């Protein structure tokens, strides 16, 4: 193609998307089965005829976790948060590096997959020691995640190059977001990298007899929280800089948008103890500090809610809608690229609400490790992030391929988006509710059918969600292939501008402060030292490694 000759970043981007969705599809095959399980219905005999390599509910659960929460979300982030700044800056990302990042991701994913498919690493996506997986799982996962360090390089490159040609100009919006995002992702990433290099790899290679569980978990959750922000921000970039165009309006504030991002750089990483509220050997004063900081990181989404709601209202008003509710009907509800994100945001209301409870230190003892947690996150990632990614098919795919979306394809997109949204909501009810009834997360409950009689009601929701989502998923498979494998090509589509919104003047002072990135980067990194340093120093000073086990 002449267009790929001129915009090679289109094709690398496409590869990240497709691989991402393929990861999503396979990971998601296990969802309906898990939903049916949380409804006390056992359809694994079915799954095991259809996919004979699957040995247990927990192998399936690992695949689901790893492929949906690690692989898909990452590919997506790398697609969005590279290509978008590249288009706004109208500059070419380093193509050698972009390809390198892709191969790393693909290679690492392939290597990790082998043990997973072979049933040699049925730990889960959290891989907590001393459950001990195959070295290939840890190594494949490490190289997969490391793929992102290249992405970080790519975007800082593009950035500095733009600044050099444009001294004394403020960073453009998407690029500002992309930069604070990647720098955030860098600090965040170090927890897991540390964990894999100092403990998990030597351990799985047989170089050390055991790992200290508590240090593993503490390092893990260093990365483990900001990762969800690393998953979320690609969606927010789109929600902020694109959706307002799609809805028929404008972004009501660039500075507000920058502020939210900035806050995530500063606050996404020093918070991980909120996943360790029930852990021994971690001081309660530290748990409380981390809790307070977690309530703070809620703030940029509290902000986002308003910035975004106000933008959608503005779009709705521009298109004629009047009243308290009129601006809602006025929006482009026929357009899957608008619908998917907005619906995602609706679910995000109870989502963030669950998050907020989780954050509150003692309140966590009510819900910790119950079905409530899955209830919270499906709202956030399986719903908001996923739907946002889904709706990008309908504007990004054509932009990247020149492949057109038929009227028929659009209608199916709408169906897919709504059914997925709704199935996620139904499920969200069954899980939260089952969680409050003390049902454990990560558990093959259908195989202990008389264990949770009090959950009879939420169980019907989970079954229902289960069937609804299987339908939605089936229809997304057929949907995605129909576009991807489609005949027609209209190259005028690939040469179109991306639908970036215009901004509605102004706190230039604020924008300038927010643009002192190096400064904010350092601050954020200082916060991680202050919030993790004291505890890690004490943990490392008293390591207590323990034998690994394979209980599957």
């Amino acid at each position: 193609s002449r267009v790929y000759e001129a915009y090679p970043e289109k094709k690398a981007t496409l590869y990240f998307l497709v691989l991402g969705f393929l990861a999503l599809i396979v990971g998601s095959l296990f969802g309906p089965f898990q939903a049916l399980n949380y409804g006390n219905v056992d359809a694994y005999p079915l799954l095991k005829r259809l996919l004979p390599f699957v040995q247990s509910y927990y192998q399936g659960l690992t695949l689901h976790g790893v492929l949906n929460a690690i692989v898909f979300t990452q590919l997506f982030a790398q697609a969005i948060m590279v290509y978008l700044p590249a288009r706004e800056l109208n500059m070419r990302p380093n193509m050698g590096l972009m390809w390198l990042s892709w191969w790393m991701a693909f290679i690492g994913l392939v290597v990790a997959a082998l043990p997973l498919l072979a049933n040699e690493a049925t730990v889960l996506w959290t891989f907590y020691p001393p459950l001990k997986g195959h070295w290939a799982f840890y190594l494949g996962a490490s190289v997969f995640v490391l793929s992102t360090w290249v992405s970080i390089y790519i975007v800082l490159d593009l950035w500095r190059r733009w600044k050099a040609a444009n001294p004394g100009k403020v960073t453009p919006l998407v690029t500002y977001m992309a930069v604070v995002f990647w720098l955030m992702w860098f600090l965040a990433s170090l927890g897991l990298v540390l964990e894999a290099v100092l403990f998990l790899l030597p351990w799985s290679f047989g170089l050390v007899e055991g790992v200290d569980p508590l240090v593993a978990r503490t390092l893990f959750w260093w990365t483990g929280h900001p990762i969800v922000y690393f998953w979320l921000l690609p969606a927010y970039a789109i929600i902020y800089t694109i959706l307002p165009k799609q809805a028929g309006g404008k972004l009501v504030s660039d500075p507000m948008a920058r502020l939210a991002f900035l806050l995530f750089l500063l606050l996404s990483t020093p918070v991980g103890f909120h996943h360790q509220f029930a852990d021994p050997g971690i001081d309660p004063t530290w748990k409380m500090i981390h809790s307070v900081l977690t309530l703070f990181v809620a703030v940029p989404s509290l902000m986002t809610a308003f910035t975004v709601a106000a933008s959608l209202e503005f779009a709705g008003r521009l298109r004629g809608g009047r009243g308290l509710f009129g601006w809602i009907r006025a929006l482009p509800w026929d357009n899957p690229a608008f619908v998917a994100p907005v619906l995602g945001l609706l679910g995000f209301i109870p989502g963030g609400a669950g998050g907020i409870v989780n954050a509150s230190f003692t309140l966590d003892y009510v819900v910790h490790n119950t079905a409530w947690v899955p209830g919270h996150f499906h709202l956030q990632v399986a719903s908001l992030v996923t739907l946002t990614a889904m709706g990008s098919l309908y504007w990004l795919l054509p932009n990247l391929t020149g492949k057109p979306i038929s009227d028929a394809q659009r209608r199916l997109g709408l169906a897919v988006v709504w059914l997925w949204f709704l199935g996620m909501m139904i499920m969200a009810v069954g899980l939260h509710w089952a969680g409050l009834l003390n049902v454990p997360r990560r558990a093959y409950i259908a195989q202990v059918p008389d264990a949770y009689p009090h959950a009879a009601v939420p169980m019907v929701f989970n079954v229902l969600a289960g069937i609804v989502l299987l339908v939605a998923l089936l229809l997304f498979i057929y949907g995605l292939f129909s576009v991807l494998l489609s005949r027609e090509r209209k190259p005028e589509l690939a040469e179109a501008p991306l639908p970036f919104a215009e901004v509605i003047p102004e706190d230039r002072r604020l924008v300038l402060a927010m643009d002192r990135i190096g400064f904010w980067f350092a601050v954020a990194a200082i916060l991680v030292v202050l919030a993790y340093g004291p505890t890690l120093v004490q943990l490392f000073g008293h390591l207590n490694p323990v034998p690994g086990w394979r209980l599957w």
């Binding site: 907590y128 459950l131 009501v252 504030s253 021994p280 902000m303 454990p440 195989q447 323990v546």
Partner: protein
């Protein structure tokens, strides 16, 4: 109109951001409170107390389950619980109602949950560490312990029992 909508949008967002901040602060204050009551007993002890999971069943307080329940105060019992694949010892745990129970829980294998159905006890149990938590059972009877951390193929059926005597 565009200029005006912008100022009004911005003006109210500040309203919201200050209220949201207030609300968050009040939650902080309400968590602080819980921290000061007995309800806070279920927060683990932040102190490191290392053990050897390879010998814990052969020597030390976890070696003989029938002696796990030790009176350590006038109205206080310490209980050495082992969480393991796939169950808890002793079974059952027997404690008096109204007494304050310092659970000291460890694992010989892998991580397990220790979630006492009906109560706020919900603590990760890591091999090599003793998790310490405290609770006063106010109502007598039978409480189920659920393992709520994946621990291998027997996870779904790993349950224990605490009996609280009148």
């Amino acid at each position: 109109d565009e200029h005006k909508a912008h100022k009004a949008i911005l003006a109210y967002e500040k309203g919201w951001l200050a209220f949201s901040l207030a609300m968050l602060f009040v939650f902080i204050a309400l968590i602080a409170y819980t921290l000061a009551t007995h309800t806070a007993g279920v927060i683990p002890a932040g102190k490191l107390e290392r053990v050897d999971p390879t010998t814990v069943r052969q020597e030390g307080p976890w070696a003989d389950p029938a002696q796990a329940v030790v009176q350590t105060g006038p109205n206080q019992y310490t209980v050495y619980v082992l969480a393991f694949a796939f169950g808890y010892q002793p079974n059952p745990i027997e404690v008096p109602q109204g007494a304050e129970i310092v659970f000291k829980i460890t694992s010989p294998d892998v991580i397990h949950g220790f979630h006492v159905e009906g109560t706020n006890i919900n603590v990760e149990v890591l091999p090599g560490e003793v998790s310490t938590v405290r609770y006063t059972f106010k109502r007598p009877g039978e409480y189920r312990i659920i393992c709520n951390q994946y621990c291998g193929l027997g996870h779904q059926n790993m349950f224990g029992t605490i009996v609280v005597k009148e």
